[PDB]
Amino acid sequence: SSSVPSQKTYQGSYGFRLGFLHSGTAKSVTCTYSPALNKMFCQLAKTCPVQLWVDSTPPPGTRVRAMAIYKQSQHMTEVVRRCPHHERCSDSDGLAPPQHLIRVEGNLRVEYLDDRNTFRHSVVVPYEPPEVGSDCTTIHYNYMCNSSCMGGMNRRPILTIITLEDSSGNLLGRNSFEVRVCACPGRDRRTEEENLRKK
Amino acid sequence: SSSVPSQKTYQGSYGFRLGFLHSGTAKSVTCTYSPALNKMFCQLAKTCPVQLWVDSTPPPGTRVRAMAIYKQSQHMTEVVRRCPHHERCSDSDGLAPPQHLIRVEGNLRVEYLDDRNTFRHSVVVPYEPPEVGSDCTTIHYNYMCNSSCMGGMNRRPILTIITLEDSSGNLLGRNSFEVRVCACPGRDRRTEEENLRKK
Amino acid sequence: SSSVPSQKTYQGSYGFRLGFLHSGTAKSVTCTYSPALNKMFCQLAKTCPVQLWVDSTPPPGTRVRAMAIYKQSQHMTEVVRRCPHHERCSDSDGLAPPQHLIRVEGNLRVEYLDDRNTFRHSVVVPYEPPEVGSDCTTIHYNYMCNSSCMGGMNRRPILTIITLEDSSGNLLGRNSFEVRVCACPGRDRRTEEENLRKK
Amino acid sequence: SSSVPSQKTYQGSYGFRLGFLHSGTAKSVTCTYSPALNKMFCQLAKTCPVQLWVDSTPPPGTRVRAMAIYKQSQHMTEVVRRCPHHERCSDSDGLAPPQHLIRVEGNLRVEYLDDRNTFRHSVVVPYEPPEVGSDCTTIHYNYMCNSSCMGGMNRRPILTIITLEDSSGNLLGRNSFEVRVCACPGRDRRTEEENLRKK
DNA sequence: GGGCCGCCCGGGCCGCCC
DNA sequence: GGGCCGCCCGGGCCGCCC
Ligand SMILES: [Zn+2]
Ligand SMILES: [Zn+2]
Ligand SMILES: [Zn+2]
Ligand SMILES: [Zn+2]
């Protein structure tokens, strides 16, 4: 079987969708999402709010998993990992393994997983329904390397795959978005959107 | 009996066909398929996505085998192997014999076979139906020598033969395409397509 | 005492001087020395010939040590080391510690030392007089990181300090030159020489 | 000490010089020497006559050694060897190790040596004075790879170093010349001589 | 917010076929 | 002897300094 997780959108029985904040485009804004590109632009280690929307509430014990894969076919097989420089940096929260690219901040029940067959990394939190009167549940992700990091992503674009799963790991829903971790998310979003409109 | 495997197209009971991505034509693109030539142009060791399409799902235990043979009659008899230089290069994935031209990346159940009678190499993975909502199953192949390699293919064109087989080795379907492994797949595809249109 | 080794030129009793080949200026030449800047421009891991000239022959047991220090006052204190990415690369010659920036190739008696007090790296070979009829002795050095390497030199210029020492470590002579390890030594030498002439 | 043998010309006590036949420049002549370049152009495995001239006769037991080194500083450290393809070719004379680039044909007392410290290859024959009435002693060398061989010389020019030595290995004399092993020695000699006269 | 170094890019330069 | 594929080449395109 393939060692590359599927990226196919699957809203599933609960109508699972992702939402992103309306952020702006100042040159070095910490995080900003492009709907035209379905692509998040963000700085290293900064908060990236991701909204979980459902049409109906999934059962208790539902989990939310985030995992990165390289976007290009030529690189899908390679596990996405932190580069050796940032791996050795003293910046662990005491829970996230230093090799993991994606973290979750502000959650008491975070789990960091290494797949036993594919060796891919992922980070898991329990699914929580929105507060009564709220439309969605917001998770704060962090990406611990720039897309450009030498010896790590090395300028290769990645996708983040968000899955809703039961406690057994069965797929309840799946969505994805592209990520660029860079120094100037506002400049780069504008550049990439202009290259899109030009072509 | 002939030691040269058949290349005859056979869609079979399950309507087996191959598909290829719409790739582009930049001078040194890593992989690009020419429908006019039914020919894949790719760089050494780079990802070559090949799509498996069926009209109906073959049974569990079905296998997908890929094998290379020289295209020209004068060379069909000779086993396709890596050249001595690349055979000795430390580029093994720990599974593929260093002599094998064709590898599969990103699959946990890959097998590398040497025919006991013909000594030809092949690489096998289990057939997997596409995800629900997907049209095909994609396999990532790698070719570990240039077509031009001295002491190996030595500028002789090859065919890749893809067979659908049951677990006993019975034939369920067969397709094939020409392969050129080269430094500049975009240049060489254009050159060969132009020579086709001129002739 | 200072943990920063002196860079002061000292020709000493034997008239110790350095010489460099007349190299050229093509964009990506592997190594080229600028007399205007007393600066070597070279590519990662490529041969850097350095000539040892003396007015008279030092005694047997003389050693030639090479050590790097950061040029700028702000960085002199920090030990010059390879970055984490290149430290983990499998490029060791079986002798050079993976942390050492400077190597010597083609010498059977090379030693790699870590100072017990300052922890600075250096590489040592025996001094050999030139062949009869030759004017100098040539050593081939290699620099195993780019000056720009993240987590290593990180765009900070270095000096290479070459010392002539007796077997006890007493100083017999000392010379030095600036080094930039970069992808395009010819481009960068021209750029820096033009900035010199303009200023 | 350096693992790179000296190439310095040393006529020595016996006035040791090399001579080469006047050959011509037909496109694919098997061997032709350029005095303007001090460079031999020859085809793979073909006879390359090399003349040994002395002003006076060296003692009995004198040996003649030929050894190849790469000409460019960047490659001097690497041992010159046959490529993996020609190494596996069944073309040994029963004496020459398949890895050795340089052979001697037509000599009953040929020795093939692998240096115990540098691992460099060489081929040795006894020195013989010319016949009475003859001016020189001619040795027939063969080069068993093209300069272009992938995984071997890989288009890097080499020097052949010819040394006169006593039975102990002491240096009595040394000369050298560049070698290009190629398919068309006449064409390539003319090309390289024209590039010389142009510049 | 303006603007200043590794790597990608298309042009074009040696064994073998004719 | 004429002439037809991997690799070298100079132009030019993302973190950090200002
Ligand atoms: Zn990083
Ligand atoms: Zn090969
Ligand atoms: Zn480095
Ligand atoms: Zn060869």
3-state SS string for D142-166: EECCCCCCCCCCCCCCEEEEEEEEC
Rounded-to-integer distance, Cα D189 and Cα D143, Å: 17
Rounded-to-integer distance, Cα B61 and Cα B166, Å: 6
Phi and psi at residue A186, in whole multiples of 5°? -65, -50
From residue D75, alpha-carbon distances to A50, A100, C106, C122, C183 in Å are 54, 40, 10, 24, 19
Q: Cα of D88 to ligand 4 centre, how many Å?
A: 10
Sheet of strand D31-34, all strands in order from the earlier edge strand to the far edge: D31-34, D39-42, D171-181, D158-165, D63-70, D121-126, D111-114
The single residue listed with the structure tokens 């040791």 is D16
Strand F–CB A85 distance below 7 A = no
> Can you say whether residue B138 is alpha, beta or left, with left for phi > 0 and alpha for psi between -120 and 50 degrees?
beta
**CA angle, A183 then A101 then A125, to 5°:** 120
Q: How far is CA A4 from the centre of its chain?
A: 16
Rounded-to-integer distance, Cα D114 and Cα A53, Å: 73
Q: Which long-range contacts (CB under 8 A, 24 or more apart) does C69-72 make?
A: C69/C4, C69/C5, C69/C7, C69/C120, C69/C158, C69/C159, C69/C161, C70/C153, C70/C156, C70/C157, C70/C158, C70/C159, C71/C156, C71/C157, C71/C158, C71/C159, C71/C178, C72/C156, C72/C157
Q: Which two three-digit tokens encode residue A28? A: 């070095």
Strand E–CB A184 distance below 7 A = yes
One-letter amino acid of A90:
S
Q: Cα of C43 to ligand 4 centre, how many Å?
A: 28
Rounded-to-integer distance, Cα D128 and Cα B37, Å: 64
Sheet of strand A137-143, all strands in order from the earlier edge strand to the far edge: A17-19, A48-53, A137-143, A102-104
Task: From the CA of D18 to the C1' of E5: give the distance in Å.
Answer: 49
* D149 neighbors D83 (Cβ within 8 angstroms): yes
Chain B residues whose CB is inside 8 A of the D84 CB are 83-85, 87-88, 151
Rounded-to-integer distance, Cα A124 and Cα A63, Å: 7
Judge: A77–B47 Cβ closer than 8 Å, yes or no. Answer: yes
| Residues in contact with D79: Cβ distance below 8 Å, sequence separation at least 6, in sequence order | D118, D119, D120, D121
Q: Cα of A182 to ligand 4 centre, how many Å?
A: 47
| Residues in contact with D56: Cβ distance below 8 Å, sequence separation at least 6, in sequence order | D13, D14, D15
Say if A and D touch: at least 3 Cβ pairs within 8 Å: no
Listing DSSP states for C15-58 in one string gives: T-EEE-------TT-SEEEETTTTEEEE-TT--EEEEEE-SSPP
* C14 neighbors C58 (Cβ within 8 angstroms): yes
- Which alpha helices (H) appear in A29-184, and where do they start and end? 84-88
* B113 neighbors B102 (Cβ within 8 angstroms): no
H or E stretch at B67:
strand B63-70
Strand E–CB C165 distance below 7 A = no
**Chain B CB within 8 Å of residue D88 CB:** yes
Q: Which two three-digit tokens encode residue C39? A: 């600066």
Rounded-to-integer distance, Cα A191 and Cα A187, Å: 6
Rounded-to-integer distance, Cα D125 and Cα D191, Å: 34
Rounded-to-integer distance, Cα D126 and Cα D115, Å: 18
Strand E–CB C188 distance below 7 A = yes
Q: Which long-range contacts (CB under 8 A, 24 or more apart) does A124-127 make?
A: A124/A63, A124/A64, A124/A65, A124/A66, A125/A63, A125/A64, A126/A61, A126/A62, A126/A63, A126/A64, A127/A52, A127/A58, A127/A62, A127/A63, A127/A64, A127/A164
Rounded-to-integer distance, Cα A189 and Cα A24, Å: 10
Rounded-to-integer distance, Cα C192 and Cα D10, Å: 41
Judge: C83–A83 Cβ closer than 8 Å, yes or no. Answer: no
Task: From the CA of C103 to the C1' of F7: give the distance in Å.
Answer: 28
Which chain F positions have some atom within 7 A of a protein CB? 1-3, 5-12, 14-17
SS (H, E, C) chain D: CECCCCCCCECCCCCCEEECCCCCCCCCCCEEEECCCCEEEECCCCCEEEEEECCCCCCCCCEEEEEEEECCHHHCCCCCCCCHHHHHCCCCCCCCCCCCCEEECCCCCCEEEECCCCCCEEEEEECCCCCCCCCCEEEEEEECCCCCCCCCCCCCCEEEEEEEECCCCCEEEEEEEEEEECCCHHHHHHHHHHHHHHC
**Largest distance between two CA atoms of chain B:** 47
Q: Which nucleotide lies at the shortest CA–C1' distance from B27? A: E10
Q: What is the dihedral angle through the alpha carbons of D67, D72, D77, D79, rounded to the nearest 10 degrees?
A: -40
Instruction: Of C3, C174, C179, give the one whose Cα is nearest residue C76.
Output: C3
**Chain B CB within 8 Å of residue A8 CB:** yes
Class of domain A1-199: mainly beta
From residue D109, alpha-carbon distances to B2, D63, D126, D130 in Å are 50, 11, 7, 17
Rounded-to-integer distance, Cα A67 and Cα A46, Å: 17
The single residue listed with the structure tokens 């049951």 is B166
H or E stretch at C181:
strand C171-181
* B52 neighbors B165 (Cβ within 8 angstroms): no
The single residue listed with the structure tokens 């006590």 is D13
Q: Cα of C146 to ligand 4 centre, how many Å?
A: 34
Closest chain A residue by Cα to residue B43: A74
Rounded-to-integer distance, Cα A66 and Cα A176, Å: 9
* B158 neighbors B63 (Cβ within 8 angstroms): no
Strand F–CB C186 distance below 7 A = yes
Total residues found in chain C within this entry: 199
Listing DSSP states for A154-180 in one string gives: TT--EEEEEEEE-TT--EEEEEEEEEE
Say if A and C touch: at least 3 Cβ pairs within 8 Å: yes
**CA angle, B168 then B170 then B174, to 5°:** 135
* B196 neighbors B89 (Cβ within 8 angstroms): no
* A7 neighbors A160 (Cβ within 8 angstroms): no
Indicate which of C85, C87, C91, C147 best probes the interface with A, i.e. most A CBs within 10 Å of its own CB: C85
One-letter amino acid of B73:
S
Judge: D2–C30 Cβ closer than 8 Å, yes or no. Answer: no
Q: Exposed, middle or buried, C89 (CB in 10 Å: 0-12/13-18/19+)?
A: middle
Question: How far separated are the first and last CA of chain C, in Å rounded?
Answer: 37
* D154 neighbors D148 (Cβ within 8 angstroms): yes
The single residue listed with the structure tokens 């293919």 is B153
Q: Exposed, middle or buried, C64 (CB in 10 Å: 0-12/13-18/19+)?
A: buried
What single DSSP character describes residue A73?
G
* D16 neighbors D64 (Cβ within 8 angstroms): no
Instruction: Of D156, D137, D135, D134, give the one whose Cα is nearest residue D145.
Output: D156
Rounded-to-integer distance, Cα D111 and Cα C51, Å: 36
What single DSSP character describes residue A74?
G
| Residues in contact with D183: Cβ distance below 8 Å, sequence separation at least 6, in sequence order | D28, D43, D146
* C58 neighbors C17 (Cβ within 8 angstroms): no
What single DSSP character describes residue B47?
-
Ligand (nearest to CA of C89): 3
Q: Exposed, middle or buried, C139 (CB in 10 Å: 0-12/13-18/19+)?
A: buried
Contact map slice: A 45-64 vs C, CB within 8 A: none
Rounded-to-integer distance, Cα D96 and Cα D142, Å: 11
**Chain B CB within 8 Å of residue D150 CB:** yes
* C21 neighbors D73 (Cβ within 8 angstroms): yes
- Count of C-beta atoms within a 10 Å radius of residue B116: 6
Chain C residues whose CB is inside 8 A of the A98 CB are none
Indicate which of B20, B32, B107 best probes the interface with A, i.e. most A CBs within 10 Å of its own CB: B107
Rounded-to-integer distance, Cα A140 and Cα A50, Å: 6
Indicate which of B150, B153, B154 best probes the interface with D, i.e. most D CBs within 10 Å of its own CB: B150
Smallest CA–CA separation between A42 and chain B, in Å?
29
Instruction: Of A62, A66, A103, give the one whose Cα is nearest residue A82.
Output: A103
* A4 neighbors B106 (Cβ within 8 angstroms): yes
The single residue listed with the structure tokens 């629900």 is B132
Between strands A39-42 and A171-181, the pairing is parallel
Q: What is the dihedral angle through the alpha carbons of D128, D131, D133, D136, rounded to the nearest 10 degrees?
A: -40
Q: Which two three-digit tokens encode residue C145? A: 């990181």
* A173 neighbors A163 (Cβ within 8 angstroms): yes
Q: What is the dihedral angle through the alpha carbons of B131, B133, B136, B138, rounded to the nearest 10 degrees?
A: -50
Instruction: Of B41, B44, B46, give the one whose Cα is nearest residue B26.
Output: B41
Q: Which two three-digit tokens encode residue B190? A: 């254009």
One-letter amino acid of D141:
Y
- Which alpha helices (H) appear in chain B, and where do they start and end? 84-88, 185-198
Q: Which two three-digit tokens encode residue B77? A: 């008899």
Strand partners, B160: B68, B177
**Domain chopping of chain C, boundaries:** 1-199
**CA angle, D36 then D42 then D48, to 5°:** 95
Rounded-to-integer distance, Cα A118 and Cα A3, Å: 5
Rounded-to-integer distance, Cα D81 and Cα D144, Å: 10
| Residues in contact with D108: Cβ distance below 8 Å, sequence separation at least 6, in sequence order | none
Sheet of strand B17-19, all strands in order from the earlier edge strand to the far edge: B17-19, B48-53, B137-143, B102-104
* A42 neighbors A188 (Cβ within 8 angstroms): no
- Which residue among C30, C126, C133 sits closest to D8, beta carbon to beta carbon? C133
Phi and psi at residue B40, in whole multiples of 5°? -95, 130
* B166 neighbors B63 (Cβ within 8 angstroms): yes
Closest chain D residue by Cα to residue B148: D150
**CA angle, C65 then C70 then C75, to 5°:** 140
The single residue listed with the structure tokens 């190594």 is C31
Rounded-to-integer distance, Cα D112 and Cα D138, Å: 19
Rounded-to-integer distance, Cα D40 and Cα D46, Å: 12
> Can you say whether residue C119 is alpha, beta or left, with left for phi > 0 and alpha for psi between -120 and 50 degrees?
left
Between strands C17-19 and C48-53, the pairing is antiparallel
* D52 neighbors D64 (Cβ within 8 angstroms): yes
> Can you say whether residue A122 is alpha, beta or left, with left for phi > 0 and alpha for psi between -120 and 50 degrees?
beta
Q: Which two three-digit tokens encode residue D185? A: 């020695």
Strand partners, C2: none
* A121 neighbors A79 (Cβ within 8 angstroms): yes
| SS3 state at A189 | helix
- Which residue among A2, A8, A75 sits closest to B107, beta carbon to beta carbon? A2
Burial code of A125-142, b = ≥16 C-beta within 10 A, e = fewer?
bebeeeeeeeebbebebb
Total residues found in chain B within this entry: 199
The count of C-alpha atoms lying within 13 angstroms of the C-alpha of D4, restricted to the half-sphere facing its C-beta, is: 23
* B121 neighbors B68 (Cβ within 8 angstroms): yes
| Residues in contact with D194: Cβ distance below 8 Å, sequence separation at least 6, in sequence order | none
When computed from its CA atoms, the radius of gyration of chain B, rounded to whole angstroms, is 16
- Count of C-beta atoms within a 10 Å radius of residue B141: 22
Strand partners, B179: B40, B158
Residues bordering ligand 1, an ion, CB closer than 5 Å: A 83, 86, 145, 149, 152
| SS3 state at A113 | strand
Task: From the CA of D85 to the C1' of F1: give the distance in Å.
Answer: 29
Rounded-to-integer distance, Cα C82 and Cα C78, Å: 12
Please name the residue whose C-alpha is nearest to the C1' of nucleotide E6.
Answer: C183
Rounded-to-integer distance, Cα C49 and Cα C107, Å: 13
Sign of the dihedral through C-alpha B71, B73, B74, B77: positive
Closest chain D residue by Cα to residue C43: D74
The single residue listed with the structure tokens 């997908």 is B64
Q: Which two three-digit tokens encode residue B2? A: 């002939």
* C178 neighbors C38 (Cβ within 8 angstroms): yes
Please name the residue whose C-alpha is nearest to the C1' of nucleotide F1.
Answer: D27
D83 known ligand binder:
yes
* D112 neighbors D100 (Cβ within 8 angstroms): yes
| SS3 state at C177 | strand
- Count of C-beta atoms within a 10 Å radius of residue A28: 12
D42 known ligand binder:
no
**Chain C CB within 8 Å of residue A84 CB:** yes
What determination technique applies here? Answer: X-ray
Strand partners, D114: D121
Smallest CA–CA separation between A117 and chain B, in Å?
8
Rounded-to-integer distance, Cα A71 and Cα A158, Å: 5
Instruction: Of D68, D46, D52, give the one whose Cα is nearest residue D17.
Output: D52
From residue D6, alpha-carbon distances to A50, A132, C190, D165 in Å are 67, 85, 33, 14
Ligand (nearest to CA of B81): 2
Rounded-to-integer distance, Cα D187 and Cα D29, Å: 9
Q: Which two three-digit tokens encode residue B20? A: 């290829």
The single residue listed with the structure tokens 């997907």 is B134
Instruction: Of D111, D122, D81, give the one whose Cα is nearest residue D98.
Output: D81
| Residues in contact with C93: Cβ distance below 8 Å, sequence separation at least 6, in sequence order | C103, C105
One-letter amino acid of A43:
Q
Rounded-to-integer distance, Cα B23 and Cα B166, Å: 32
The single residue listed with the structure tokens 């062949």 is C131
Interface size, chain A vs chain B, as Cβ–Cβ contacts under 8 Å: 37
